[PDB]
Structure formats: structure tokens, C-alpha cells
Design a binder for this molecule. Structure first.
Ligand SMILES: [Ca+2]
Ligand SMILES: [Ca+2]
Ligand SMILES: [Ca+2]
Lengths: 259, 255, 258
């Protein structure tokens, strides 16, 4: 089913959003069908497309990465290859047995580009978005026209937007904190005077301002996620994917940078 | 056959112009040989390259498209494939039957890219312009060096330039008008007062100043095109192209 | 597989202009590769510039701002041109004098596969001169080893002075060649105006653009002598590269009459 101009414009806009927002559009639309793969989408699909994008952009450290949206076909190829390698590694056999419908398919380079071109790249821009990867991965029930029908005219609720942006503000505080850590680290290797101030600062860093600001940003995020979840996540507390993603992400953040 | 550095400089400059200018240069140069294919070039070739470019740039509506110049090999492949698809479609039989020498050829993807590397991509930039498509499609009688021979030192006449620019002024007024109609149309689906007010405004759109300015632009373009057509009708590709462009605009947006 | 610190260094080096990539690689591997330096300069670096130039729509070398890396399609052009150059009978002496610098012909498919599997070390879809070098000379060079060898080498200021002095020569070359081409074009004009352009073109070497280029050349020559006398660490690549480049500039823009 070719898309109307109106649906294509929608699709193209979603597909230029940061990957995580593409993911949430997908998850909201298909929550009834796909909720049990959410964890794979989050932990494996997202991480992998992000790493492929980082390399493309010559970024090594996650805290310096501004999240991307789509990949050219050569970079997509590295994405799908990395997916297959991850899932084929016995160290991750849990992911493979627990999420069969999420498993990628190994293909030669040639067959891969032919699938991108024939099937995955639905707006014909020579780019692969996370959205496009998702739709094709879950094609037993998902497809672009269906997706647009499901997702069009469902605007992000303001409580949800607040909570998403509060989470993005945690990212900003994490970057500020990790950049300063790394600043100090690299001065740490200045023998003398100093050189030496750097060391104590580094040693003291988690009682410093930037760590303080991160700790408080984590509380704000959490409060905002809660009020959004209470309002839209049903008991336990359409927007279900956004609710699940934000809680997952908060969880990850707290684990890594909380008390 | 291999371009001199001077011919190559020219060739590169023409391939950076918007596709439609690429088209005119090629048509002026080869009018004797190619004039009867002009409708295909305009209605199938050009339309298809513009849509390929459009998609690459994330544009769906022709009034929001700023005209491009070349495509990478992945987009080029979509372009050539869409040509084949269109021309093999029974509903387009008449383009296939009437314009046999303009028909594309089906290739696999590896065969295609290899053709783009070996034959089509004459300046080795990794891109396919409309000029490069055209030159190879009609290789029976055209080629790069002969094209540069035929095309260099034939400056666009000022009267023709003026008409071309007056036609682009129409495009600008089309865009302003369609952009307002779309904004109103959007607004129109808001529940209650606001939606109703925008539905009313849409009914008035053709009395409005945007439309007035489009009608004005159309009249000026028509004047400019007739001035140029009377004088020059070597320049035959440009005259054909601007009349064709003008006729289409008048049909869509004239009385 | 590089560490984060190494990979960052590598990516930074690979975004420098091709000639600085070259110097990085040559400074690092001078022991093992010294004898191929002329092939890297006159064949590898020329061919990669030209592929880059074409990609950017530039036809004349004096109009080109040096790049840093190529997409896979342009890399393919680069490798095919290397092979073509090396297979031309007129260039048999490059083939024979520099056998370890020799490229291998591949089909397009196989080329792109090798770019992807072997050459494109930082997985960015681009081929840098550094990447081409590391893989061509992989018998003794690899990315980790390179970073190990290079991260601890700094460009001494007298050497940077020299590099920059040579780039100043490039800017004066451009100004001169642009005026030569402008007069050349002007001398087309059939009347007495072609005659005036024709004469200015004929006299151009006694003009001030050429004078300014002569000064730049001489200043680069002092700056290069200073660097070379002090360090000729080790900065063996850099010292070789500046002198070689100076020699080239002298041959084309220095005294011409014998
Ligand atoms: Ca796409
Ligand atoms: Ca080209
Ligand atoms: Ca690379």
C-alpha cells in the first residue's frame, strides 16, 4: 500500500525525529501487538542503531552523542550486521530465545542492500530510520500505511512531553558531569602544579556541583514520569509505549547515576 | 571524446544547474535530432528525476520543492527503476509506443550501478545529473564532447532568461498560494469555531491577494515568454520548454 | 579493536587533510616504509586528491582545498585509478621500483566488500588516506600499532612553521594561476583587448603576483632548512615530506631557464 501524500509527510516527519521518539511512535501504535518485544527494541535495537550512527559521526563516548535519525545504506549495513552478530553470540542467547519475532536475518551485503531498497526504505530517500527498521522487522503485523493510520492525529500529551524533556535534561546533566570528569582526568596526567588539583577534584567529584545538579535532575525526571504515568498508564499507576519507554529509561538512568 | 579540462569545467557547471536548465541546454544542443522526444523528456524524464530528488529530500508536494541538480547512485537507481516501471505500465502504453527512442532499459541493481560508474557518471563525481541521464539515453547521437562543442559559447539570450525567471516568479506565487490553502485546510479540521472560520476563508481564497498576485505573475510570464518566442522561434529547446511550462501553469492556475 | 582514546585519536588524524595523514603515517612507519615515500607522495596522494577533487567538482589542482576522506563510491574510483595508473606501460618504473605499494585490481563488489570488511576501520562509511595506507602496508602496519606509534609524537614548532610556510606557497600559487587563467581567457578576445591580455599574460612572470609567490617560496625554503637542520621525534616523515614538497614547488615555480 503506497501512502497518500498526507501519510507520507507524517511518516517522513516521524522518521526524522530522534531514534527514541521514532521508537515511541512505533510502540504507542503497536503496543497491543508488540509490547513483549519492547525490551529488545530498547536494549538491542536502539543501542545498536545508536552505535552505528555514532561511528558514522566519529563519536566514541555516549555522553557526547546527540541522538540521530537515519542511516545511509552503507551505515545501515553495519547496523544490521552488528544486530546479527549480537543476537548470534551465545552470551546473548537469552535475547534470542526470549524474543524470536525480533530476531534479525543474516544476509550478504548484496542481498541486504537489495532488501533496503525493495522493502525497508519506504520513503525512497536512500536512508534507513529506526522507524523503517521496526516496521520491516515486525512486518507480520506492522506496515507503513497501517502505522500512519494508527499514529496520525495522536499528539503527544503535555504531561508526557514534560516527562520526556525532563529525561532529556538528565542527559544534559550527565554530559556536563562526564565532561568535567574527563576534563579533570586528562589534567590529572599533568605532573605538578597542577596537575594535582585535578586529582583531588576528580576524587571529590561526586560531592561537587555537577553531580549535585544531576542528582536533582534525576528527581525531577522521576516526578515528571510518575505524574505522566499516573495520568495515562492505567492501573499499575495509546500512550502505553511512551509510558513504558520513559520508565525504562528512568530506571536505566537511576541505576547508572543515582545514589 | 575525453573532455578537455575546459570542456569538463563547462560540463560540470551545466550539471550543477537545476535539472530543467540541464534539459534546456541538452534540448538546444540537440534539437535537430531530439525535438520529437521533448514531450517525453519533459513529462516523463524530468518529472521522474524531480520526484526521485524530492523523495531524497523528504518533499512530497511539488510547490514546496526547490529544484535539484543531481542524485547519488542509490537515488539514481530509484530514478531509473521508476522510469522502467512507468514505461512498462499498461496505462502508459502511449508514452512507450510514441517515444520508443526515449525508453529506458531494465537492469538489475549491480548492472545499473556498474553502468552508472562506467558510462553515465562522466565527471566521476559519484552523482547522476539529468544531463548525464539524457546524454547516455540518447547516445545514438549525443555524447559529452559533442555536447560541449554544441553547447559552449551559446549564452542564454537575455529575453529568454527574463522569461525563465518570470516563470520561476510564477512558481514562487504558486508556493505562497498553495501554502496558504494548505494552512487553512489544516486549520479547517480543528473542532468548533476555528475550523469553521478556516473553512469559510478557504471558500474566499481565490478572491484573495495571494491569488491576485499569482494571476499577476501569470500575465507577466506570458508577456515575457511571447516576447522571447516571437524573437527566437539553437534556442528552440528553450522556447519549446518555456511555452510548455507556461501552458501547464495557465491550465492549472489560469481562468 | 582500538580503545576509546585510540579510536578518538585515529578519527581525528583521519579528518586532517590527506597530506597530514600521510605525514602521520610516515613519521610512524619510517623504518619500514621510507623507500615507498615517493610513491606515496607522487602516486597515492595525487590519486586520492584527484578523486576528491572530482567528487567536489574541481578540475584544477590550484583551485582545490585539500580533503580528508571519500565515500565508498568515490573510494572505488580512487582504487581503480591507482590500478589504472600502475598498469599503464608509461609508468612501469613506478610499478617496479615500488612493489609493496602496488594496488590490486578488484571487481566493484569485491572492492566494496574489502572497504567494508578491512579498510574502513572506524566504521564511518568513508575511506581516509590513513586508512588506505594502513591497509596497503598491512604487512607491517595496523591501526592499533599506528596509534601506539603516533599518539606520543608531537609536531615540533619549527616543523609546523615549515608546513604552514609551504601552505602559504599554495595560496600564492592559487592567486598566480588564477590570474594566468583569467588573462588566458581574456586573450581570447579578438580585438586589441585580446592583444593587451595576450601581452599581460606573456609578461606575467615579472609581475607582482609571481613576485609574491617567489617570496613565499624562498621563505618556505628558509623555514624548511631550519626544521630539517634541527631534526633531520623522529619527524623523519615530516622532514622528508616538506623537502619533497618544496622541491616540487621549486621545480614548477622556481627558476625555469637552464
Ligand atoms: Ca528512508
Ligand atoms: Ca556525475
Ligand atoms: Ca573510515
Amino acid at each position: 500500500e503506497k501512502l497518500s501524500a498526507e501519510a507520507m509527510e507524517f511518516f517522513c516527519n516521524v522518521a526524522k525525529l530522534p531514534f527514541s521518539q521514532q521508537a515511541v511512535h512505533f510502540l504507542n501504535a503497536y503496543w497491543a501487538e508488540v509490547s513483549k518485544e519492547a525490551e529488545f527494541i530498547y536494549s538491542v535495537g536502539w543501542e545498536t542503531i545508536k552505535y552505528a550512527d555514532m561511528h558514522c559521526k566519529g563519536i566514541q563516548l555516549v555522553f557526547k552523542y546527540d541522538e540521530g535519525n537515519d542511516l545511509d545504506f552503507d551505515i545501515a549495513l553495519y547496523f544490521y550486521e552488528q544486530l546479527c552478530k549480537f543476537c548470534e553470540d551465545p552470551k546473548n542467547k537469552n535475547y534470542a530465545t526470549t524474543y524470536p519475532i525480533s530476531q534479525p536475518q543474516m544476509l550478504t551485503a548484496l542481498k541486504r542492500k537489495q532488501e533496503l531498497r525493495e522493502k525497508v526504505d519506504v520513503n525512497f530517500d536512500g536512508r534507513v530510520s529506526f522507524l523503517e527498521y521496526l516496521l520491516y522487522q515486525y512486518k507480520d503485523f506492522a506496515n507503513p500505511a497501517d502505522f500512519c493510520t494508527r499514529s496520525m492525529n495522536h499528539d503527544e500529551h503535555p504531561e508526557i512531553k514534560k516527562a520526556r524533556l525532563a529525561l532529556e535534561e538528565v542527559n544534559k546533566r550527565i554530559r556536563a558531569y562526564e565532561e568535567e570528569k574527563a576534563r579533570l582526568t586528562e589534567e590529572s596526567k599533568i605532573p605538578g602544579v597542577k596537575g594535582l588539583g585535578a586529582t583531588n577534584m576528580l576524587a571529590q567529584i561526586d560531592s561537587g556541583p555537577l553531580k549535585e545538579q544531576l542528582n536533582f535532575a534525576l528527581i525531577s525526571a522521576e516526578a515528571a514520569v510518575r505524574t505522566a504515568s499516573k495520568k495515562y498508564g492505567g492501573a499499575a499507576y495509546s500512550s502505553a509505549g511512551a509510558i513504558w519507554w520513559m520508565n525504562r529509561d528512568l530506571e536505566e538512568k537511576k541505576k547508572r547515576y543515582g545514589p
